[PDB]
Design a protein around this ligand. Sequence first.
Ligand SMILES: Nc1ncnc2c1ncn2[C@@H]1O[C@H](COP(=O)(O)OP(=O)(O)O)[C@@H](O)[C@H]1O
Ligand SMILES: [Mg+2]
Lengths: 239, 568, 96, 195
Amino acid sequence: SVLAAANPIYGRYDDLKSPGDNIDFQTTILSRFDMIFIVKDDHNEERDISIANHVINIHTGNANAMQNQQEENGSEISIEKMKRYITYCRLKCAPRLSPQAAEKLSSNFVTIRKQLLINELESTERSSIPITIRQLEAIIRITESLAKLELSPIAQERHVDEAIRLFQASTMDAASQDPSLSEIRRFEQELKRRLPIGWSTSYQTLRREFALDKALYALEKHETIQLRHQGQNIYRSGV
Amino acid sequence: MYYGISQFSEAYNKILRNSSSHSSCQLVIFVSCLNIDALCATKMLSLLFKKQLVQSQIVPIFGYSELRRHYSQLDDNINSLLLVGFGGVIDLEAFLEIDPQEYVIDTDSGEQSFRRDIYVLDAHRPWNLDNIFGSQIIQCFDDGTVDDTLGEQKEAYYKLLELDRKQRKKQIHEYEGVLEEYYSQGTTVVNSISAQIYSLLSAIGETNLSNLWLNILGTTSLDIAYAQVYNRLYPLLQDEVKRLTPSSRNSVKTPDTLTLNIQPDYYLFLLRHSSLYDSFYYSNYVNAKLSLWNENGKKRLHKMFARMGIPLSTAQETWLYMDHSIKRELGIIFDKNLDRYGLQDIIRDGFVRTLGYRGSISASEFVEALTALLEVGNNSAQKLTNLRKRWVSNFWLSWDALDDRKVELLNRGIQLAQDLQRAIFNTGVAILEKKLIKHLRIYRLCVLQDGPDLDLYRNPLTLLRLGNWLIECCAESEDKQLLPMVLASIDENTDTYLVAGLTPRYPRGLDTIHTKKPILNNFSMAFQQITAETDAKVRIDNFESSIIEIRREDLSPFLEKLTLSGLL
Amino acid sequence: FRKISRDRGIIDKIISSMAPSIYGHRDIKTAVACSLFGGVPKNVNGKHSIRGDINVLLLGDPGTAKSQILKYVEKTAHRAVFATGQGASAVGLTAS
Amino acid sequence: MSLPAHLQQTFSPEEIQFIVENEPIKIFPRITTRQKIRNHTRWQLITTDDKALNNMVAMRSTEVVLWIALLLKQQSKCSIVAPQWLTTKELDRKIQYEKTHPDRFSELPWNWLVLARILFNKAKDDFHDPIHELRGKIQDLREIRQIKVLKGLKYLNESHLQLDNLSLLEINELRPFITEIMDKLREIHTASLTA
Ligand SMILES: Nc1ncnc2c1ncn2[C@@H]1O[C@H](COP(=O)(O)OP(=O)(O)O)[C@@H](O)[C@H]1O
Ligand SMILES: [Mg+2]
């Protein structure tokens, strides 16, 4: 198994640039990897305080006590024990999918490929992160590993649901990164002038007015509108 | 006196008559955990009652609150109670709410009998005169102090008891002064409970090698803080070892022979279970005599090892695998090259027990292993109870360590002892480098506010271990005059401190007239007096009287009032 | 060493004594002194390892004694190696 | 079901010890229950003879059931006398017999292993011979008898087998193998002889 750590060009991700510009790896090499994690520096104050307080505890000797206490509490496993457990699981269990699990995996692979197709059609450019049959086998392998760690001879739908969640959190997240313009500007101007600052309009009405309408999501980023009633109501948040 | 030395057999026979019924379990033994002497005494009692098939229950109690709660929970069928390691310094009938009229049966005919007998069994000398003299339910296993050194107190107590003009009032105040001067005395220890129970066994005739070994362990538990007591009791153990060892000496070793021996047992730290270098380095006495805490101490140690001609590679080798040339010349080498550094007191005679082919072990090492197992074996008023629960649980680990079939637990205890001594050394060098001990004209305070592994010191035994380290270091410094020391350790989870008022002691091996008079720990009365007024959420429940748990915010005013208190 | 370390303001003396024949640049001297003394390399439980050495980057206009400070550090430090610009390949910097 | 799987057709070694503990043994009492001519509770048991228990005289050898001898030896109230076969001379004689006749077992009592273990554990100080030598000879006898068994389990036919002089614990530990291999070699034979 290959666990490879890389770095996008320019060091930082630079989400202003296209997702294909940050990653210099070819599609062929990127297709082998089952899960392609793209982590980012959130620069969130509440998370930064937590990270700082954790790192300081690491430095000021507090780790040698806290980790030992957690391990003896039973919420952790020492390296010498996890290594033996991993060897035992690998030499004892090789789970195979149940038919209900296989139906879920197929119906999810179709959804994933449809989403990739619509993203490619919208962007009119092949996605840098590929989704192929090798990724269906990747989800199969993740499901079987999740079942294996429990020594379950057959992989239920719980493992399929968790494997699907893991794939969505890693490779779909990597592939979903996004950077016409005249239509976006027209939509923003017309809804700013028509829909007042303090009121709300329903989305079916905006559809009648008319697309994918990513302009509404962009405005939601700018905190000028807000979809509240389960997406059925578009409310001008006050900007 | 209540029960002298010569009449322990009377108490044992009374216990047998009252509660040696196979129908039920009418005997309950209350043992104070965090006390090796009480642990060995209770092991002796357990073996003795196993021989006579006397059903009994052994309860480890940590504090006085637990004792009161258990006694309240105690059923009325249980007609024999043993308190091991505590109860001799408090008004037990008052503390437990005991009135003799509700426990008396068959009052008639100059005799009295009671439906429950409480036998207190401890070594702390401030005997409560209402226990040793003015109560029949409470029966104290005296060691001969009361019948010889409490005549004046006996007369003073009885005169006031019987008497309920100017001459009468003056004499009452004179007698009441005798009682008062008897109190306001620090709590010391004169004897070992293990030796007392071994004397009882000698009276009954159940002595054997295992009981003698438990006696040796209990006595050697006192050598660190009460070396005068250990030196007093040592000749008796030396005679007993000679008496019990079989005449078939110099025989070949067989996988069944158990040998108690009196051989040179140097006063190092786990010498046989760790390297020679680590035995010197982590020894309390060597540290005091060389000041290894500073940087120059390690250089002094290396220079000493070079002087003896022991290579550092050989010195750091594990004691089992040390070359037989060096290991067989330790006595000669130590004779030649120890008086130079003032470590002549390192050479000593101790007891070493070998069980067949399992290798030697000395009582000094065994008690360190037992202590380690007691200490680290496994919103605010609840987590503390969880700590008490774990502390009670560790008592059974230390108890099972005594069995010869659980050597795999004694080895774990040895490893824990080495780790705890390492942690104690690290915290000691951290305290002595930052100069945390604030010198005063009353008591040298020292508060642990922050650092590593500070959760080790919420245990009273580990805190006492660190305090003994510091006190040994200070005792060998001539400039530093003798003065009580205070240690505190903040518990972050409960936001409470653990103040442990200690006592100073003279340098080991220094025998003088003032050394003969023991030093008395006056912190108990001071703590109780300060807590009685000025409510400060102080928890005075430990059998070790000079240890309290105080709130984080209330610590400083408490220490201020203690400074204003001239009791100690 | 132990006698002069107890002095108040020993850090300022040490900093001021880095490049004695180079005027000003107290921030650079402070950074170089910190790098020369270094930090403590941690190792948590034998699994997590934290770097314990301080890296310094001197970026500035020409003729500001950046190379002279480097030459001084080479003179002072115990084990020092000097490599420059294009005259240092990838495998000669690390291992070949 | 009512009887666990590991207790189906064999005896657990605890049950073998239980069976052995019912055999009489000779003891030297440290008490005296013999009522004098000039109260007291008598044993009056129902699965053995109480006559030798109500008439114990200190240091006068009697015979009591083993599980009672052990009960008294729990205190210091008796002293179990080792059987004559449990001495170094007799063990050496039996070892010589085993080394001399490689086709048949020696005539050790059926409970020799169980009795040796029980007496070594509970009566370790009642042997006229050093126990460190009795253990070393018991182990030697066990090793020789194990060598002879492994060379006779090479004769597991489908008709029968004569394991003469074999002990009870050895038979108990060999039962699930011998009695389940011979069953299969018998099923094969009966299947062949279906004509
Ligand atoms: N602050 C300063 N004090 C003394 N000399 C300086 C100073 N700054 C620069 N110099 C002189 O400038 C000369 C050239 O410096 P150089 O090593 O070329 O710096 P750089 O490589 O950054 O251009 C040196 O001989 C040095 O003596
Ligand atoms: Mg330059």
